[PDB]
């Protein structure tokens, strides 16, 4: 229940599963690795993560052990090129979530009976981060979105899913003024949302929780503890992590509501260089 609880490595032991073990082969993506805690108390929430178009899962793979070491199952999927559009990326993520849902009943799976399939999140890089936010539109029962330097040009983001957007100030591929910032502002004002731009960060800056000197992981994990796991003890943690993280940011926009130990906080603050 403190910003110290956001340490990389968390406390749980991490193991992995894949199609090599019998995991469902989802038709809408190319390969999965499931990172899961071996010694957390069931059930576990899950997050599905997808890299940008053409990019291999190794580009975002450090999120897997990070989230799983904190009790959150992570399914990282690859792509074979299909369509150069963030909407095929949304459907890939939804198919990854179906793989998680089936995994909860898969005979011989170490995760049989251990997944809370109503606590599902999505995350993605570049067009995968546009896809993650569109996945929330297409399936508004998803519990959180973590977008990593998202790319999506003509966004309709009509959803109520708490969404955390990371961006890179120096991102040439998905420049924040044309992407992340627009995604933040077109998401409904009543939707819980948070925008964090890494000062001088390139397009890859949120590909690992170590981005922003660790700020990326601290904010992402706090966000999921609150909105995916429904653990209000992490409301004040996120707030502290945000203040602590301003040193490495060039822009923060907050518009989210959160219950702490003493009451309700409706944060709408903005930081700019
Ligand atoms: K496949
Ligand atoms: K799979
Ligand atoms: K705050
Ligand atoms: K809001």
Numbering used by the authors: 6 to 278
What does the paper say about this structure?
To ensure that this C-terminus does not affect catalytic activity, a deletion mutant designated PET30ΔPorC was created that lacked the sorting sequence between the amino acids 300–366. Activity tests confirmed that it was not affected in its activities using pNP-C6 or PET foil. The crystal structure of PET30 without its C-terminal Por-domain (PET30ΔPorC) was solved at 2.1 Å and displays high structural similarity to the IsPETase. The structure was solved at 2.1 Å resolution, containing one monomer in the asymmetric unit, with 16.2% for Rwork and 21.9% for Rfree. The PET30ΔPorC protein shows a canonical α/β-fold consisting of a central twisted β-sheet composed of 9 β-strands flanked by 7 α-helices on both sides, as already reported for homologous structures, i.e., PETases and cutinases. The structure of PET30ΔPorC revealed an extra β-sheet (β10) which is located at the C-terminus and connects the PorC domain which has been deleted in this construct. PET30ΔPorC represents the overall fold of several PETases as revealed by a similarity search performed by PDBeFold. One disulfide bond is present in PET30ΔPorC (C262-C285), a common feature for Type II PET-degrading enzymes. Here similar interactions of the HEMT molecule by the PET30ΔPorC protein can be deduced mediated by Y178, T200, H230, W152, F80, and M154. PET30 shows a less hydrophobic surrounding of the catalytic pocket when compared to the structures of Type I and Type II PET-degrading enzymes.
